[PDB]
Coordinates of C-alpha atoms and ligand atoms in Angstrom, one line a residue:
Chain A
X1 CA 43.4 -31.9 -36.7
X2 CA 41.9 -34.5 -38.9
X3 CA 39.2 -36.7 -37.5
X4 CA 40.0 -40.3 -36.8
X5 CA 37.4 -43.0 -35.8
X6 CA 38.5 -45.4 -33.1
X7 CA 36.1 -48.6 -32.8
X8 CA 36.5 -50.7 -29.6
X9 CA 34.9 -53.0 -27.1
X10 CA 34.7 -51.0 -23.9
X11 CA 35.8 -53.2 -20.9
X12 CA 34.7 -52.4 -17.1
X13 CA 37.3 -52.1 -14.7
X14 CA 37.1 -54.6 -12.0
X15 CA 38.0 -52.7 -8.5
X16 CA 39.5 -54.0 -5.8
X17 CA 36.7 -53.5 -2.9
X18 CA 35.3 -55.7 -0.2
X19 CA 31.6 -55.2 -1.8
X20 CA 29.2 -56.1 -4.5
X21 CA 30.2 -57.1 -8.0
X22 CA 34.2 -56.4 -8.7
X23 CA 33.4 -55.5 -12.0
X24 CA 31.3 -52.4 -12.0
X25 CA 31.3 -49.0 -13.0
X26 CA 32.9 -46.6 -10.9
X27 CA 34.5 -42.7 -10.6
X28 CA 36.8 -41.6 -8.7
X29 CA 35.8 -38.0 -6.7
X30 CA 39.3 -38.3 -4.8
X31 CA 42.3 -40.2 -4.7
X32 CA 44.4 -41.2 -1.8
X33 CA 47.2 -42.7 -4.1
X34 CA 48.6 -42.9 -7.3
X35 CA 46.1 -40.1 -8.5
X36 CA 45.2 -40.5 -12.2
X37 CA 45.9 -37.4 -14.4
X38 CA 46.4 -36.6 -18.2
X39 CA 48.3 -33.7 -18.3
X40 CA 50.7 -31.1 -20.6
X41 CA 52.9 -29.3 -18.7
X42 CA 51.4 -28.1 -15.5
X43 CA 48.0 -28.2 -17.3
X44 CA 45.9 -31.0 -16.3
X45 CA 43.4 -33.5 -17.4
X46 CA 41.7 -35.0 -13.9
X47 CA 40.8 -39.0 -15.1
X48 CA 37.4 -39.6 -13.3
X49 CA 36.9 -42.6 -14.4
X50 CA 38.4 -45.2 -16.9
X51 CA 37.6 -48.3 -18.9
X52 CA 39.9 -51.3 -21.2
X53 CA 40.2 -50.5 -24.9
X54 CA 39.7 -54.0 -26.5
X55 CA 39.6 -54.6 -30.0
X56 CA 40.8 -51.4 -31.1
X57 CA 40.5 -50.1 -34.6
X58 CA 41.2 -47.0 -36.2
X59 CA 39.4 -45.5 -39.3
X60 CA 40.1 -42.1 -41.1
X61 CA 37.6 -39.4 -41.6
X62 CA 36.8 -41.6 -44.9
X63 CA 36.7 -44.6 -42.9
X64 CA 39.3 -46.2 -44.4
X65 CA 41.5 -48.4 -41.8
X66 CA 44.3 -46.4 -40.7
X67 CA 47.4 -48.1 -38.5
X68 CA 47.6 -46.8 -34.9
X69 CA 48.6 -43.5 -34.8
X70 CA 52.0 -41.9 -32.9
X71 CA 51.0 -40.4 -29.7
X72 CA 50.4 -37.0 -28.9
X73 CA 53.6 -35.1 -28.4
X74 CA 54.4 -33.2 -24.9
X75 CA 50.9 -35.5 -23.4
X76 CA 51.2 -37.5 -21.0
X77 CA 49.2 -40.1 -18.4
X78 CA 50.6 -39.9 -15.1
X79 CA 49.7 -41.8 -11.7
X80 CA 50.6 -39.7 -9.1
X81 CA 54.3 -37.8 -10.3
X82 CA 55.4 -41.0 -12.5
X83 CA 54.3 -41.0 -16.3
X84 CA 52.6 -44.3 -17.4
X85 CA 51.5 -44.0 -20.0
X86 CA 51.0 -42.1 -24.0
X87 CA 48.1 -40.7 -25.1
X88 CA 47.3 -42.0 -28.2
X89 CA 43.8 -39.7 -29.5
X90 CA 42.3 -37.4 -28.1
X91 CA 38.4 -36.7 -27.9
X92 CA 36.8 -33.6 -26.6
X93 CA 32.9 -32.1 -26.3
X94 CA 31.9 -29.1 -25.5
X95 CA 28.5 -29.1 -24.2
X96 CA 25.6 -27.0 -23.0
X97 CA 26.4 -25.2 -20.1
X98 CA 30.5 -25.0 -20.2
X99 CA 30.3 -28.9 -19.8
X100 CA 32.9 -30.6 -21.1
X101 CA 33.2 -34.3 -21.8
X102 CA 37.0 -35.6 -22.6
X103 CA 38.3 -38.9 -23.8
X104 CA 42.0 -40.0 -23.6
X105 CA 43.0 -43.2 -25.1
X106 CA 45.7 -44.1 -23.2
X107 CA 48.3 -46.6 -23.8
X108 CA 49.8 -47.2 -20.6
X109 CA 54.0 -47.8 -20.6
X110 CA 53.9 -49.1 -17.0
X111 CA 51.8 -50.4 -14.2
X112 CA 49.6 -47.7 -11.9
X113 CA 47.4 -48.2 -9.0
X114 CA 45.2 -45.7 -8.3
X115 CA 43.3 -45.6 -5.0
X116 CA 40.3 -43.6 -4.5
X117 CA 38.8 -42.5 -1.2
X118 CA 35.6 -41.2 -2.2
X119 CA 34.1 -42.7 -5.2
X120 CA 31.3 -41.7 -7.6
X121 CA 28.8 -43.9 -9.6
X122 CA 26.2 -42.6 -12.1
X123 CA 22.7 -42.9 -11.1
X124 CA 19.6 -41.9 -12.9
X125 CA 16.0 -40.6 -11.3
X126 CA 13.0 -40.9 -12.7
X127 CA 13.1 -37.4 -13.5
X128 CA 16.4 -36.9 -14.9
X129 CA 16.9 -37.2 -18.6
X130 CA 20.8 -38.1 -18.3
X131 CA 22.6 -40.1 -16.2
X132 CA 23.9 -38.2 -12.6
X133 CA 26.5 -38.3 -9.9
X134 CA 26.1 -40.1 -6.6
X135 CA 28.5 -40.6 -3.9
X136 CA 30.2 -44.1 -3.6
X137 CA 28.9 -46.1 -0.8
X138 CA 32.6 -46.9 -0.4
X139 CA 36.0 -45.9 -2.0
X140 CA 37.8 -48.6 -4.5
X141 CA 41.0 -49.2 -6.2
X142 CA 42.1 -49.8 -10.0
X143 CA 44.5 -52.0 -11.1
X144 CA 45.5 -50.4 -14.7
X145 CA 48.0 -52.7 -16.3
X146 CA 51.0 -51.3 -18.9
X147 CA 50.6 -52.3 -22.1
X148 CA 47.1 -51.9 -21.9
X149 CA 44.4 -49.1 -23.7
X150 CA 42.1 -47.2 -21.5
X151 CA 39.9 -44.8 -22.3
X152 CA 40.0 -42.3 -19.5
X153 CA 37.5 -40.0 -19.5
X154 CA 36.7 -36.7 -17.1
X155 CA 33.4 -34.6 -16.8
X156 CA 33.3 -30.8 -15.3
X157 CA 32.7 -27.1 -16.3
X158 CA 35.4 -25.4 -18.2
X159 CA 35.8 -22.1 -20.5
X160 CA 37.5 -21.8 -23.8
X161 CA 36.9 -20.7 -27.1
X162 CA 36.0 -23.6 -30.1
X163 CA 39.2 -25.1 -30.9
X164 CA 40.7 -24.7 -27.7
X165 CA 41.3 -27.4 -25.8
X166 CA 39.9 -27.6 -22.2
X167 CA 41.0 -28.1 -19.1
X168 CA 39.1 -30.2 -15.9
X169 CA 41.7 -30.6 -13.5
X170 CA 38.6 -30.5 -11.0
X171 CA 37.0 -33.2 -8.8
X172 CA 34.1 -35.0 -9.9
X173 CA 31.7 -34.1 -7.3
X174 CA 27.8 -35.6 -7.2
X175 CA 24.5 -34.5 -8.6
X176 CA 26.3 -33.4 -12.0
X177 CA 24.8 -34.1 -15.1
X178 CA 26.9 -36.3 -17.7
X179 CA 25.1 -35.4 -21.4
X180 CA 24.5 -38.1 -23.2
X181 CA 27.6 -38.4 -26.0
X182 CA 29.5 -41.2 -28.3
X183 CA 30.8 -42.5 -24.7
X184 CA 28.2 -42.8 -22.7
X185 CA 28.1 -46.4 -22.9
X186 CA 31.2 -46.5 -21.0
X187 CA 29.6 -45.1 -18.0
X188 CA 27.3 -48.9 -17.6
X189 CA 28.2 -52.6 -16.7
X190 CA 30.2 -53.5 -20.2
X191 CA 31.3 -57.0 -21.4
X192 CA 33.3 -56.5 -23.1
X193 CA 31.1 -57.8 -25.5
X194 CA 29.8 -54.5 -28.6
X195 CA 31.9 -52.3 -30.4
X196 CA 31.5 -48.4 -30.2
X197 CA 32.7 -46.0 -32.2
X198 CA 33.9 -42.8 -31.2
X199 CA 35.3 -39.9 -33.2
X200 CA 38.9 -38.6 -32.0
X201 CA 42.0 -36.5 -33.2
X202 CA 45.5 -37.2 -33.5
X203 CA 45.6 -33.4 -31.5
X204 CA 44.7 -31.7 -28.5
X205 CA 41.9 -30.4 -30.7
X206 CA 38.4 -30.4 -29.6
X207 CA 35.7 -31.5 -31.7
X208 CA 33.0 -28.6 -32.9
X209 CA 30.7 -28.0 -30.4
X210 CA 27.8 -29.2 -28.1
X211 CA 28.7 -32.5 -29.8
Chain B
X1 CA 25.4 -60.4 -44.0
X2 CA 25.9 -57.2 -41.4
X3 CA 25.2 -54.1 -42.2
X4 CA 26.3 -51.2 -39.9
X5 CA 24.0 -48.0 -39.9
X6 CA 25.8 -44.9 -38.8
X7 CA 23.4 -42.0 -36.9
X8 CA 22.1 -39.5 -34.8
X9 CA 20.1 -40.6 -32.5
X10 CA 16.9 -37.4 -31.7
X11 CA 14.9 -38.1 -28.7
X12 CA 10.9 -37.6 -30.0
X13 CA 8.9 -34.6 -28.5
X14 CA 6.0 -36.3 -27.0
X15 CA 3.0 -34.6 -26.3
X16 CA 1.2 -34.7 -22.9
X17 CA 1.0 -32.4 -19.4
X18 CA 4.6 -32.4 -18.4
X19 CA 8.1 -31.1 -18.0
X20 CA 9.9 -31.0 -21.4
X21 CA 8.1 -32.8 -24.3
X22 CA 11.7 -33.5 -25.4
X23 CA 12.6 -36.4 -22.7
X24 CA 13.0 -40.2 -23.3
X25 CA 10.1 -42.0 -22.8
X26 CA 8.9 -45.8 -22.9
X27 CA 5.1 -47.3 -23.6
X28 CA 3.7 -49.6 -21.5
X29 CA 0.5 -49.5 -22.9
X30 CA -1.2 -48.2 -25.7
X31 CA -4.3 -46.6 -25.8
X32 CA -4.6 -45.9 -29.6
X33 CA -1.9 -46.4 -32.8
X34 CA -0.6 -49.4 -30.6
X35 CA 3.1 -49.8 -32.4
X36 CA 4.0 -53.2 -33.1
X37 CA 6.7 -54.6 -36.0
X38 CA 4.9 -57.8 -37.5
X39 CA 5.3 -60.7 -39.8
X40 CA 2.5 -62.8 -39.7
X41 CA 1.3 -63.6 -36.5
X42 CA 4.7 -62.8 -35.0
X43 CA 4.8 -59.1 -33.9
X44 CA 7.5 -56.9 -31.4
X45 CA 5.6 -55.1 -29.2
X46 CA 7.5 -51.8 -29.7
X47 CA 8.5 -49.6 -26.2
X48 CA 10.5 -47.1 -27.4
X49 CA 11.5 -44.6 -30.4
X50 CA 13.7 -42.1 -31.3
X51 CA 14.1 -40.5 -35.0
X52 CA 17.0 -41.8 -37.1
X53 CA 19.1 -38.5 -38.2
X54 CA 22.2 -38.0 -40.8
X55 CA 21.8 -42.1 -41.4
X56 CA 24.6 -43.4 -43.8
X57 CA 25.1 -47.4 -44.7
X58 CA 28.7 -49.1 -43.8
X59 CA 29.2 -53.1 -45.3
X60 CA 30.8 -55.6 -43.4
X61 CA 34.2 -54.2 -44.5
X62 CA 33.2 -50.3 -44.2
X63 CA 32.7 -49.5 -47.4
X64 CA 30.0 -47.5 -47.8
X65 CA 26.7 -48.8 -49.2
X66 CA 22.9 -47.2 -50.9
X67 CA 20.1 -47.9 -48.1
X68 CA 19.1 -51.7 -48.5
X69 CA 15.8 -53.0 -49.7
X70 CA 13.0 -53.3 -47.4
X71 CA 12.9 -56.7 -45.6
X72 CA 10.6 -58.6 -47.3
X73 CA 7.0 -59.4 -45.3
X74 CA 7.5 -57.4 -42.1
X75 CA 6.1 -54.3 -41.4
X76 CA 5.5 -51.5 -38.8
X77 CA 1.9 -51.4 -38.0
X78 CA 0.2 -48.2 -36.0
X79 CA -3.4 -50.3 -34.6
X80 CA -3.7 -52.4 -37.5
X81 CA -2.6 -50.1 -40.7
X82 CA 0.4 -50.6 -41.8
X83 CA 2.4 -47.6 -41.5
X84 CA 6.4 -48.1 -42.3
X85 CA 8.8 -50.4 -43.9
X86 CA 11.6 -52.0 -42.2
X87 CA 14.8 -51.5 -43.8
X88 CA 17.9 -53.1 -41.4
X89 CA 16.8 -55.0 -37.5
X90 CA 19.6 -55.2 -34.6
X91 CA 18.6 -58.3 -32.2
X92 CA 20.7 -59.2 -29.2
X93 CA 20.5 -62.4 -27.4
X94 CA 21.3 -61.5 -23.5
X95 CA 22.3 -62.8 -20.7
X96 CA 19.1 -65.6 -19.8
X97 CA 16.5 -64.8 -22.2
X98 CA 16.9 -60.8 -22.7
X99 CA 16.1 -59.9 -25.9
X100 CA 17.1 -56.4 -27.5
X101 CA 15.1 -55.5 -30.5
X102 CA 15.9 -52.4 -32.4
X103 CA 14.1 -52.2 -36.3
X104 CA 15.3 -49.2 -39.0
X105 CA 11.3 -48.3 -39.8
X106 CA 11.1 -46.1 -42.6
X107 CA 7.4 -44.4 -42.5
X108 CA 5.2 -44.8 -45.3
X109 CA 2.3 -43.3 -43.6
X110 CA 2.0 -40.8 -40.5
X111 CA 1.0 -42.4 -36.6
X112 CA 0.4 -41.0 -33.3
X113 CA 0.7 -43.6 -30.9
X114 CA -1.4 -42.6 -27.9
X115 CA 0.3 -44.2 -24.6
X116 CA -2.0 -44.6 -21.5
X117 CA 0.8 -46.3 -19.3
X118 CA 4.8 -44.9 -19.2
X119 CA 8.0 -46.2 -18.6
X120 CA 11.3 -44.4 -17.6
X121 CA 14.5 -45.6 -17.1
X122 CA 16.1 -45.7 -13.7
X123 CA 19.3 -46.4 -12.4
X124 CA 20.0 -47.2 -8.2
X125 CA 23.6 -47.0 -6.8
X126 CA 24.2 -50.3 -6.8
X127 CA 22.0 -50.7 -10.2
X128 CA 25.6 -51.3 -13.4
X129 CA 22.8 -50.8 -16.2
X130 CA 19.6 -49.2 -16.1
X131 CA 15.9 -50.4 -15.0
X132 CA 12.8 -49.6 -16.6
X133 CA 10.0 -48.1 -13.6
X134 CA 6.8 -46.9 -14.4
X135 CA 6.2 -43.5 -15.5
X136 CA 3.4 -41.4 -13.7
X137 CA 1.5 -40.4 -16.5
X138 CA 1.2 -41.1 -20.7
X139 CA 1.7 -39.2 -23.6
X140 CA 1.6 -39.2 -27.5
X141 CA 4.3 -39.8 -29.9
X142 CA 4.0 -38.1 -33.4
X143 CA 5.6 -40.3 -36.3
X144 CA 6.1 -38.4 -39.8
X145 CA 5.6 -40.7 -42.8
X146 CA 8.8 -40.5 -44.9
X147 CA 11.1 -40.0 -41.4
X148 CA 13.2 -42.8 -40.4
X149 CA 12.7 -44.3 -36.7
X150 CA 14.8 -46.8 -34.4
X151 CA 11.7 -48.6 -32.7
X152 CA 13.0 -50.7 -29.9
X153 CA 12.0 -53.4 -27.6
X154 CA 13.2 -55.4 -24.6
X155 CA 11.7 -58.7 -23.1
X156 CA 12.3 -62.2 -22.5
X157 CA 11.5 -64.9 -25.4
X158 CA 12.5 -68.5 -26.3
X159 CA 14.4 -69.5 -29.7
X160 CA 16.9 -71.8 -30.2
X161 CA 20.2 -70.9 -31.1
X162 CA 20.9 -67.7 -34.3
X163 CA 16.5 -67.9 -34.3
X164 CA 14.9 -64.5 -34.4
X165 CA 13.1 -64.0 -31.6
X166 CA 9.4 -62.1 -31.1
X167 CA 8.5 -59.9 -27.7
X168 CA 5.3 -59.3 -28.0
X169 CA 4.2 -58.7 -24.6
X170 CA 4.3 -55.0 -22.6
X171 CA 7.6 -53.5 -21.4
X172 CA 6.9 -53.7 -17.9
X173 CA 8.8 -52.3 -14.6
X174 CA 12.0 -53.5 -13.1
X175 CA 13.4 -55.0 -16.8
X176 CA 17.1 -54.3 -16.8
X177 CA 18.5 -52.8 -19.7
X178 CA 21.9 -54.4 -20.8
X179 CA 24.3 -52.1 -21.9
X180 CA 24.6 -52.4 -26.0
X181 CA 25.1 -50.1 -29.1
X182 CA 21.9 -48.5 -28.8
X183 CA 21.9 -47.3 -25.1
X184 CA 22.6 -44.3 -25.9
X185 CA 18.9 -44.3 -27.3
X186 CA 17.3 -44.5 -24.1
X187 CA 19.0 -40.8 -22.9
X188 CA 18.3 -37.2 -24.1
X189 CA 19.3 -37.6 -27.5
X190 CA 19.8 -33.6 -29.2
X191 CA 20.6 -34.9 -33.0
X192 CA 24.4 -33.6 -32.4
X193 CA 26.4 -36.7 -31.7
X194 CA 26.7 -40.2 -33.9
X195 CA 26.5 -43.8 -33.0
X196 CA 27.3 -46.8 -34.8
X197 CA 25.0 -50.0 -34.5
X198 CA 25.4 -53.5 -36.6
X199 CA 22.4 -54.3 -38.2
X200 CA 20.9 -57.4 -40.6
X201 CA 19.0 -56.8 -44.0
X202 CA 17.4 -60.1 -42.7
X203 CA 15.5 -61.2 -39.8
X204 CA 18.5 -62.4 -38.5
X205 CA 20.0 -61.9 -34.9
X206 CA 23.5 -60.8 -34.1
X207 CA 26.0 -63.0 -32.5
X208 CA 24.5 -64.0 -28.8
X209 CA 26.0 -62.7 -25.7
Ligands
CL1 CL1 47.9 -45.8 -42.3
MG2 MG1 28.3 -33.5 -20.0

């Protein structure tokens, strides 16, 4: 329940693809293999899109360093049927408009592959005020290595009273609007290269809302 | 030697014909209260601002810390009055010459910069940051004396390694944005979420990338 401050490098995911740069942003609107969840029981998280955890630090609510913390009970990350990996925090907005923006950090206990046929990117018009969704011009794959952190994060509409925690087991589809929050630089071209800081909880506790 | 300054970023209400006056917006050109940060001859041309919210000071080892002391001979000019200190400045040395400017002005006296020319950001589907592209018409901004500012800027400029660099010149179209701490300062910003961004007490950049 108590806030906990994870500061990181975020890390673009290189995809496997005949096109373009390797390492650039991409979401995944469906999955052919090894589909990418975060689920509790037959409640479900759908990952739309993920990025490395490098340098990761933890900090209390008084910002004092903290040491990683145990993962989540009864969570899990799972490609396809097999769990790979525990969830280690836990972040969760709810925004205007039933939107809701979730985190997991994810620490993955074995390899996964997940292949996406129809891919999203996030685009931005002259008139929008927030990134968007557009369709891929091609699908991709991931390669998401165990022992590893990802953040995996998942965008869509969802109901629930404040400290409940949501649900988007939904596809990412285009032309939604991802509000701007703490993770929003993990949606552009990163280095690897700046920290961000990004408030979590040990919990499946959401933080208070439209935040 | 770095500072951090935790915030919320607040996208400014600008004035002018269109849509919501709540919407981030960058100056090409000024046609009144031009905003520059300036030592000397050296100025930034400044191309974008957002109001610094809920600020609190973090040393290098997260302890907190008071608000520093003004930097010493730099200041935020509207036209040629002087119009805010300058307590903390983030500088990034991108990839080539990109230069990412953000100063911590605290306003000693009220502005309204008066923009003839706009920028927006824009981002293309096989665009991985985002682009500036010419807005189609201006607006005003309204600075508060007393409020706290993040007034940004992005060009190319020379210096020699750890050297602070000046962008003096307009943000014009087609500049890409590399990602960085204070991106989320160029998107609809409500005052409800916090970012942290390193910053120097000095004229001194960060660590180049
Ligand atoms: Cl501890
Ligand atoms: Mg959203």
């Amino acid at each position: 329940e108590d806030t906990i401050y994870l500061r990181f490098k975020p890390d673009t995911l290189s995809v496997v693809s005949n096109f373009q740069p390797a390492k650039r942003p991409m979401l995944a609107k469906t999955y052919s293999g090894d589909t990418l969840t975060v689920g509790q029981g037959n409640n479900k998280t759908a990952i739309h899109t993920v990025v490395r955890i490098s340098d990761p630090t933890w900090f209390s609510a008084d910002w004092d360093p903290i040491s990683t913390p145990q993962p989540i009970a009864e969570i899990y990350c799972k490609a396809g049927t097999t769990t790979v990996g525990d969830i280690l925090a836990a972040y969760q907005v709810h925004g205007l408009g039933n939107h809701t923006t979730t985190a997991y950090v994810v620490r993955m206990t074995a390899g996964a592959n997940p292949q996406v046929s129809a891919g999203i990117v996030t685009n931005k018009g002259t008139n929008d005020y927030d990134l968007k969704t557009a369709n891929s011009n091609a699908g991709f794959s991931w390669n998401l290595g165990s022992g590893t952190w990802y953040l995996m994060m998942s965008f869509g509409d969802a109901l629930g009273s404040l400290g409940t925690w949501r649900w988007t087991p939904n596809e990412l589809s285009a032309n939604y609007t991802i509000y701007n929050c703490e993770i929003i630089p993990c949606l552009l071209l990163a280095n690897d290269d700046f920290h961000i800081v990004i408030p979590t909880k040990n919990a499946l506790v959401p933080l208070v809302a439209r935040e």
